[PDB]
Structures are given as C-alpha cells and as structure tokens.
Amino acid sequence: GSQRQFARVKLPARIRYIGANREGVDARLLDLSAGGFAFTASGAPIQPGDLYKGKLLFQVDSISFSLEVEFQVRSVDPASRRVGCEFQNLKPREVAALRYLITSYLAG
Amino acid sequence: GSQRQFARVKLPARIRYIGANREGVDARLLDLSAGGFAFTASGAPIQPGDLYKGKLLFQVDSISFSLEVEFQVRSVDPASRRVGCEFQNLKPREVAALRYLITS
Numbered sequence: 001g002s003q004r005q006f007a008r009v010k011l012p013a014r015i016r017y018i019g020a021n022r023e024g025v026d027a028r029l030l031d032l033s034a035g036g037f038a039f040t041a042s043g044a045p046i047q048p049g050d051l052y053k054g055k056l057l058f059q060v061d062s063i064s065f066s067l068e069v070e071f072q073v074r075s076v077d078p079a080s081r082r083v084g085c086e087f088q089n090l091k092p093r094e095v096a097a098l099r100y101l102i103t104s105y106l107a108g
Numbered sequence: 109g110s111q112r113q114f115a116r117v118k119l120p121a122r123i124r125y126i127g128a129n130r131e132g133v134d135a136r137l138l139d140l141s142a143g144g145f146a147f148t149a150s151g152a153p154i155q156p157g158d159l160y161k162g163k164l165l166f167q168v169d170s171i172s173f174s175l176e177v178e179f180q181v182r183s184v185d186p187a188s189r190r191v192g193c194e195f196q197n198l199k200p201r202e203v204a205a206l207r208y209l210i211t212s
C-alpha cells in the first residue's frame with residue numbers, strides 16, 4: 001500500500017521562512033527526510049496546501065550549512081501544531097546534500 | 109618544491125574576519141584546500157604569524173556553506189598582497205566537510 005519513500009530522521013536542524021502576516025518563523029525540525037520535514041507551528045494560521053520558500057539550517061561544531069527550499073504543507077495537527085511538509089522542486093545538488101547529511105546522521 | 113598535503117581549487121568562496129585596524133575584512137578567495145586558503149589583502153597591514161578568527165563562506169545554487177575557523181598567516185607577497193593562510197585545529201567533522209565541498 002502506501003509507503004514512506006525516504007527514512008525520516010530527528011537530526012538537529014531549523015527551518016526559516018516567512019509565513020502568514022508576513023511574520024518570520026524560526027522553528028526546530030521535528031524530523032527531516034529527502035522528501036520533506038516537520039516542525040511545530042507558531043500561533044499564526046497555517047493550512048494544508050500552503051506553499052512557502054525558506055531556508056533549512058544545519059549546525060555542527062563551527063560548521064553552518066544552509067539550504068533554500070520550497071515546501072508545501074501536507075498536514076497540520078490542531079492540538080500539537082505539528083506541521084508536515086513536502087519539498088517542491090529540489091535541485092540535484094540540494095538532494096545530494098540532504099542525502100549526505102542524512103546518511104552521515106544514520107550510523108553516527 | 110613541496111607536495112601540498114591537500115589539493116587546492118579555485119571556487120566561489122569568501123573569507124571574513126576582523127583585521128588589525130579592528131575593521132572588517134571581506135575578501136574573495138584565490139583558492140581553497142582542506143589545509144587553508146589564499147586571498148588578496150586590500151586594507152590593514154597583515155604579516156606571517158598573524159592569527160585571526162574568521163568565517164569561510166561558500167554559496168552555489170540554493171546551497172550556502174559556512175565555517176568558523178582560526179587561521180594563521182603563512183606568507184604575504186608584498187608586491188601582490190597575496191596572503192596564504194593555514195587553518196588551525198579543525199575538527200575531523202570540519203575537515204571532512206571541507207574535503208567534501210572541495211571534491212566537485
């Protein structure tokens with residue numbers, strides 16, 4: 001039946017985008033995969049289908065690595081404000097960079 | 109003639125740090141390796157032996173990379189103001205991140 005195509009991992013990372021009310025959002029990722037991510041929304045209304053451009057932020061030691069992304073909201077949990085998102089139009093460099101982060105995180 | 113321990117490449121990258129004049133420096137790299145980098149000095153005096161804490165920045169596509177690093181000036185060509193620098197005590201995670209980015 002339905003199958004998650006990419007493993008989802010809880011590696012430390014942040015999402016930054018401009019949402020409703022032209023308010024910026026800076027939130028901790030609940031999980032991350034080659035296909036998308038999840039985070040906890042912040043008060044401002046958000047609904048499945050909403051589309052945003054933003055930056056994925058990764059920091060370890062004195063490395064900071066950033067990824068500009070387009071994502072569409074695919075689920076919003078009213079109780080927890082959990083928002084689940086799908087990347088749209090990921091460039092091959094981006095895809096590969098994501099997989100590097102995720103492969104390294106898996107197995108240490 | 110010496111064999112360079114790390115291979116050097118010419119890619120779009122910049123170095124930022126606070127110089128001797130206490131004013132900011134923001135310069136394009138001449139080249140980069142996992143061991144260090146070079147750039148042309150334009151402002152304040154700078155000499156071999158100087159230590160700085162800086163930020164190495166790279167950006168291609170939607171990808172942006174940044175490494176906070178201590179570096180030591182190894183050489184300065186007084187004529188061209190070419191500065192050659194060596195990274196100080198990088199973590200293996202950081203060297204590996206450099207060797208990755210370079211390999212391209």
Ligand SMILES: Nc1nc2c(ncn2[C@@H]2O[C@@H]3COP(=O)(O)O[C@H]4[C@@H](O)[C@H](n5cnc6c(=O)[nH]c(N)nc65)O[C@@H]4COP(=O)(O)O[C@H]3[C@H]2O)c(=O)[nH]1
Pocket residue numbers: 001002003004
């Ligand atoms: N990946 C995923 N998709 C979801 C989920 N909830 C709804 N869907 C999607 O909506 C279809 C119907 O979901 P369902 O009503 O729970 O109806 C499901 C459900 O009754 C059952 N089922 C499928 N996988 C599982 C499972 O892992 N555990 C249990 N207890 N039942 C499952 O088979 C039916 C058909 O499933 P699918 O053909 O895959 O088609 C599913 C799926 O495409 C979810 O939690 N995870």
Ligand SMILES: Nc1nc2c(ncn2[C@@H]2O[C@@H]3COP(=O)(O)O[C@H]4[C@@H](O)[C@H](n5cnc6c(=O)[nH]c(N)nc65)O[C@@H]4COP(=O)(O)O[C@H]3[C@H]2O)c(=O)[nH]1
Pocket residue numbers: 002003004005006008009031032033034035036037038074075083084085086087
């Ligand atoms: N890291 C992360 N990515 C997210 C999240 N929400 C959406 N995405 C990404 O967006 C893809 C499409 O989401 P979908 O349309 O809801 O289409 C989904 C959805 O219908 C279903 N599904 C998968 N996992 C679940 C689940 O846990 N609960 C429910 N109800 N459905 C699920 O399976 C389809 C395909 O799943 P994927 O192949 O993984 O493909 C997902 C995933 O790459 C999230 O919370 N975290």
Ligand SMILES: Nc1nc2c(ncn2[C@@H]2O[C@@H]3COP(=O)(O)O[C@H]4[C@@H](O)[C@H](n5cnc6c(=O)[nH]c(N)nc65)O[C@@H]4COP(=O)(O)O[C@H]3[C@H]2O)c(=O)[nH]1
Pocket residue numbers: 002003004074075077082084
């Ligand atoms: N439309 C959509 N919604 C998503 C997606 N991913 C997560 N969600 C929503 O976020 C809820 C929590 O996701 P979870 O923590 O991964 O917690 C999930 C997860 O651990 C598990 N699960 C459900 N489907 C799958 C699957 O297809 N593959 C795997 N590995 N786990 C699944 O079941 C738990 C509860 O799933 P849900 O009741 O459906 O509750 C999910 C769902 O409402 C997605 O891809 N598409």
Ligand SMILES: Nc1nc2c(ncn2[C@@H]2O[C@@H]3COP(=O)(O)O[C@H]4[C@@H](O)[C@H](n5cnc6c(=O)[nH]c(N)nc65)O[C@@H]4COP(=O)(O)O[C@H]3[C@H]2O)c(=O)[nH]1
Pocket residue numbers: 109110111
């Ligand atoms: N001044 C200097 N430059 C270095 C040194 N090591 C590498 N290079 C530079 O790297 C280029 C390619 O080096 P190579 O692969 O060894 O490729 C070189 C190498 O195979 C060979 N070669 C040139 N000089 C020598 C030498 O003195 N001893 C040996 N065994 N081979 C040499 O000729 C190839 C083309 O030489 P180039 O046109 O000059 O282009 C050289 C040269 O610009 C060095 O130790 N000193």
Ligand SMILES: Nc1nc2c(ncn2[C@@H]2O[C@@H]3COP(=O)(O)O[C@H]4[C@@H](O)[C@H](n5cnc6c(=O)[nH]c(N)nc65)O[C@@H]4COP(=O)(O)O[C@H]3[C@H]2O)c(=O)[nH]1
Pocket residue numbers: 109110111112182183185190192
């Ligand atoms: N103190 C110090 N100064 C450095 C260093 N690397 C570069 N420089 C200085 O900046 C010039 C190098 O520019 P290049 O593009 O690598 O172009 C270089 C380079 O391609 C080649 N080459 C010369 N020596 C070597 C070597 O020992 N090993 C290798 N692999 N190539 C060399 O010949 C060109 C001219 O080399 P130079 O006449 O020496 O002129 C050099 C030198 O004055 C360093 O590691 N330490």
Ligand SMILES: Nc1nc2c(ncn2[C@@H]2O[C@@H]3COP(=O)(O)O[C@H]4[C@@H](O)[C@H](n5cnc6c(=O)[nH]c(N)nc65)O[C@@H]4COP(=O)(O)O[C@H]3[C@H]2O)c(=O)[nH]1
Pocket residue numbers: 110111112113114116117139140141142143144145146182183191192193194195
């Ligand atoms: N990307 C880049 N990194 C730099 C530069 N200058 C210094 N570094 C980094 O700092 C290390 C020590 O530089 P060095 O003391 O001048 O000690 C140098 C230097 O004495 C010699 N050397 C290598 N290439 C050249 C050259 O082209 N010209 C001259 N005159 N000497 C060179 O080989 C030694 C070791 O060089 P490396 O193994 O590569 O190891 C170098 C390198 O990792 C630069 O201009 N560009």
Ligand SMILES: [Zn+2]
Pocket residue numbers: 001002003
């Ligand atoms: Zn299923």
Ligand SMILES: [Zn+2]
Pocket residue numbers: none
């Ligand atoms: Zn030669």
